Scaffold this active site. Sequence first.
Site, PDB file in Angstrom:
ATOM      1  N   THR A 106       0.833  -1.195   0.000  1.00  0.00           N
ATOM      2  CA  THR A 106       0.000   0.000   0.000  1.00  0.00           C
ATOM      3  C   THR A 106       0.872   1.251   0.000  1.00  0.00           C
ATOM      4  OG1 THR A 106      -0.207   0.383   2.390  1.00  0.00           O
ATOM      5  CG2 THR A 106      -1.642  -1.300   1.423  1.00  0.00           C
TER       6      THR A 106
ATOM      7  N   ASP B 214      -6.673   1.150   5.858  1.00  0.00           N
ATOM      8  CA  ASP B 214      -7.044  -0.097   6.529  1.00  0.00           C
ATOM      9  C   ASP B 214      -8.513  -0.451   6.267  1.00  0.00           C
ATOM     10  OD1 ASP B 214      -4.443   0.200   7.375  1.00  0.00           O
ATOM     11  OD2 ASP B 214      -4.871   0.119   9.521  1.00  0.00           O
TER      12      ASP B 214
HETATM   13  C1  LIG Z   1      -7.001   0.999   0.489  1.00  0.00           C
HETATM   14  O1  LIG Z   1      -7.246  -0.340   0.936  1.00  0.00           O
HETATM   15  C2  LIG Z   1      -6.529  -0.895   2.001  1.00  0.00           C
HETATM   16  C3  LIG Z   1      -5.614  -0.182   2.789  1.00  0.00           C
HETATM   17  C4  LIG Z   1      -4.939  -0.822   3.838  1.00  0.00           C
HETATM   18  C5  LIG Z   1      -5.174  -2.177   4.103  1.00  0.00           C
HETATM   19  C6  LIG Z   1      -6.089  -2.878   3.312  1.00  0.00           C
HETATM   20  C7  LIG Z   1      -6.387  -4.305   3.529  1.00  0.00           C
HETATM   21  C8  LIG Z   1      -6.784  -5.107   2.457  1.00  0.00           C
HETATM   22  C9  LIG Z   1      -7.048  -6.460   2.669  1.00  0.00           C
HETATM   23  C10 LIG Z   1      -7.463  -7.281   1.461  1.00  0.00           C
HETATM   24  O2  LIG Z   1      -6.596  -7.444   0.618  1.00  0.00           O
HETATM   25  N1  LIG Z   1      -8.713  -7.811   1.331  1.00  0.00           N
HETATM   26  C11 LIG Z   1      -9.009  -8.596   0.129  1.00  0.00           C
HETATM   27  C12 LIG Z   1      -9.719  -7.611   2.386  1.00  0.00           C
HETATM   28  C13 LIG Z   1     -10.465  -8.880   2.872  1.00  0.00           C
HETATM   29  C14 LIG Z   1     -11.805  -8.295   3.369  1.00  0.00           C
HETATM   30  N2  LIG Z   1     -12.127  -7.279   2.344  1.00  0.00           N
HETATM   31  C15 LIG Z   1     -13.211  -6.315   2.646  1.00  0.00           C
HETATM   32  C16 LIG Z   1     -13.440  -5.405   1.426  1.00  0.00           C
HETATM   33  C17 LIG Z   1     -14.288  -5.819   0.392  1.00  0.00           C
HETATM   34  C18 LIG Z   1     -14.492  -5.000  -0.721  1.00  0.00           C
HETATM   35  C19 LIG Z   1     -13.842  -3.766  -0.807  1.00  0.00           C
HETATM   36 CL1  LIG Z   1     -14.086  -2.734  -2.197  1.00  0.00          CL
HETATM   37  C20 LIG Z   1     -12.995  -3.346   0.218  1.00  0.00           C
HETATM   38  C21 LIG Z   1     -12.792  -4.165   1.328  1.00  0.00           C
HETATM   39  C22 LIG Z   1     -10.848  -6.678   1.902  1.00  0.00           C
HETATM   40  C23 LIG Z   1      -6.912  -6.983   3.968  1.00  0.00           C
HETATM   41  C24 LIG Z   1      -7.148  -8.332   4.273  1.00  0.00           C
HETATM   42  C25 LIG Z   1      -6.990  -8.809   5.577  1.00  0.00           C
HETATM   43  C26 LIG Z   1      -6.586  -7.942   6.593  1.00  0.00           C
HETATM   44  C27 LIG Z   1      -6.338  -6.599   6.299  1.00  0.00           C
HETATM   45  C28 LIG Z   1      -6.494  -6.128   4.996  1.00  0.00           C
HETATM   46  N3  LIG Z   1      -6.239  -4.830   4.757  1.00  0.00           N
HETATM   47  C29 LIG Z   1      -6.753  -2.238   2.274  1.00  0.00           C
HETATM   48  N1  LIG Z   2       0.466   2.453   5.182  1.00  0.00           N
HETATM   49  C1  LIG Z   2       1.267   2.609   6.263  1.00  0.00           C
HETATM   50  N2  LIG Z   2       2.367   3.391   6.223  1.00  0.00           N
HETATM   51  C2  LIG Z   2       3.167   3.548   7.296  1.00  0.00           C
HETATM   52  N3  LIG Z   2       2.949   2.950   8.482  1.00  0.00           N
HETATM   53  C3  LIG Z   2       1.883   2.133   8.659  1.00  0.00           C
HETATM   54  C4  LIG Z   2       0.961   1.917   7.533  1.00  0.00           C
HETATM   55  N4  LIG Z   2       0.003   1.081   7.971  1.00  0.00           N
HETATM   56  C5  LIG Z   2       0.282   0.789   9.266  1.00  0.00           C
HETATM   57  N5  LIG Z   2       1.397   1.422   9.678  1.00  0.00           N
HETATM   58  C6  LIG Z   2       2.001   1.318  11.026  1.00  0.00           C
HETATM   59  O1  LIG Z   2       1.877  -0.037  11.481  1.00  0.00           O
HETATM   60  C7  LIG Z   2       1.210  -0.065  12.745  1.00  0.00           C
HETATM   61  C8  LIG Z   2       0.384  -1.333  12.935  1.00  0.00           C
HETATM   62  O2  LIG Z   2      -0.817  -1.224  12.180  1.00  0.00           O
HETATM   63  P1  LIG Z   2      -2.211  -1.747  12.780  1.00  0.00           P
HETATM   64  O3  LIG Z   2      -2.104  -3.251  12.906  1.00  0.00           O
HETATM   65  O4  LIG Z   2      -3.299  -1.179  11.900  1.00  0.00           O
HETATM   66  O5  LIG Z   2      -2.324  -1.047  14.232  1.00  0.00           O
HETATM   67  P2  LIG Z   2      -2.664  -1.825  15.614  1.00  0.00           P
HETATM   68  O6  LIG Z   2      -1.713  -1.245  16.631  1.00  0.00           O
HETATM   69  O7  LIG Z   2      -2.681  -3.323  15.406  1.00  0.00           O
HETATM   70  N6  LIG Z   2      -4.265  -1.324  16.102  1.00  0.00           N
HETATM   71  P3  LIG Z   2      -5.611  -1.762  15.078  1.00  0.00           P
HETATM   72  O8  LIG Z   2      -5.814  -0.512  14.253  1.00  0.00           O
HETATM   73  O9  LIG Z   2      -6.756  -2.055  16.018  1.00  0.00           O
HETATM   74  O10 LIG Z   2      -5.137  -2.959  14.289  1.00  0.00           O
HETATM   75  C9  LIG Z   2       0.383   1.204  12.796  1.00  0.00           C
HETATM   76  O11 LIG Z   2       0.227   1.663  14.140  1.00  0.00           O
HETATM   77  C10 LIG Z   2       1.236   2.175  12.020  1.00  0.00           C
HETATM   78  O12 LIG Z   2       2.165   2.784  12.920  1.00  0.00           O
HETATM   79 MN   LIG Z   3      -5.022  -0.107  11.646  1.00  0.00          MN
END
Ligand SMILES: COc1cccc(-c2cc(C(=O)N(C)[C@@H]3CCN(Cc4ccc(Cl)cc4)C3)c3ccccc3n2)c1
Ligand SMILES: Nc1ncnc2c1ncn2[C@@H]1O[C@H](COP(=O)(O)OP(=O)(O)NP(=O)(O)O)[C@@H](O)[C@H]1O
Ligand SMILES: [Mn+2]
Length: 270
Positions: free
Chosen positions: A88, A155
């Site tokens: 990402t 996320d």
């Molecule tokens: C900009 O986007 C982002 C940014 C950051 C993280 C993820 C991100 C992306 C995924 C992922 O790859 N998938 C396929 C997921 C499975 C469930 N699903 C729901 C969903 C349905 C349809 C649509 Cl349109 C949007 C979301 C999407 C992920 C999986 C598991 C755990 C974490 C995750 N974090 C996505």
């Molecule tokens: N795209 C990104 N770019 C830079 N840093 C990131 C990015 N995504 C996540 N991080 C860092 O990675 C850490 C862990 O992500 P994440 O698992 O979302 O937080 P977490 O502490 O588990 N709480 P939750 O949001 O409930 O999952 C975040 O706190 C950010 O500091």
């Molecule tokens: Mn998060």
Amino acid sequence: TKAVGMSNDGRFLKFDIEIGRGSFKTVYKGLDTETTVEVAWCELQDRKLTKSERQRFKEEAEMLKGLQHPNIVRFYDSWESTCIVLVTELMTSGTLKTYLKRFKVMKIKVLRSWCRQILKGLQFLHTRTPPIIHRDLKCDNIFITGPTGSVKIGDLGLATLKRADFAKSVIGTPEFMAPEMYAAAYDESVDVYAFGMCMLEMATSEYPYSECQNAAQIYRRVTSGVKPASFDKVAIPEVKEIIEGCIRQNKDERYSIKDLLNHAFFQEET
Ligand SMILES: COc1cccc(-c2cc(C(=O)N(C)[C@@H]3CCN(Cc4ccc(Cl)cc4)C3)c3ccccc3n2)c1
Ligand SMILES: Nc1ncnc2c1ncn2[C@@H]1O[C@H](COP(=O)(O)OP(=O)(O)NP(=O)(O)O)[C@@H](O)[C@H]1O
Ligand SMILES: [Mn+2]
């Protein structure tokens, strides 16, 4: 910097530089060799995944890759390795949560600007076809990046597409419906509610319902009319009025995202 991992197409490099650690997620610094831009290389604990569910993940990853909005974290690719790797956009300035954990009184100019960018991101998601409901909006899932400290929603793991029918791909509705089952037909307004709580957190530098002891207590106060204790501490009446219109117990009484963007508070351009 030497690469310790690579995507199969050779586009994305992984560096042994940890930039974040979650309970089920580790984020490494990476590089997109097609643009020479760095990216976030996220390694996720792979669940037991049925083959249908793995296919739905690939289907949804293609949809995510097609999203492009200045206030949504960019999604580049996903694949399996031996865990699930997500590539990402790299957020250089941390989450909104870490800003609130370092300072205590956000200035109203920033509250207006940062919240407006959040609403633009939600408006984008809610106007896709079908609409995307984030479902997991919180200050930890909102990021700051770039020279001008732009605000982006990230996320989308808990997100879902909006559907009309009760069950997926099976038409019909139950007749002896338990009350909780009737309430399970929520829509994008759950993101309006979460936005109101995020705005409350940014305006008070306090976690909403901090006074509560466990997750179970959190509910019953909403329904009995008892808002968060921090709500009664918002010192800006216009800000307090916006939050109130977002966290109303009945969804039909709440703001929509477009109504919020047309509010005088966010129509201010300064
Ligand atoms: C900009 O986007 C982002 C940014 C950051 C993280 C993820 C991100 C992306 C995924 C992922 O790859 N998938 C396929 C997921 C499975 C469930 N699903 C729901 C969903 C349905 C349809 C649509 Cl349109 C949007 C979301 C999407 C992920 C999986 C598991 C755990 C974490 C995750 N974090 C996505
Ligand atoms: N795209 C990104 N770019 C830079 N840093 C990131 C990015 N995504 C996540 N991080 C860092 O990675 C850490 C862990 O992500 P994440 O698992 O979302 O937080 P977490 O502490 O588990 N709480 P939750 O949001 O409930 O999952 C975040 O706190 C950010 O500091
Ligand atoms: Mn998060």
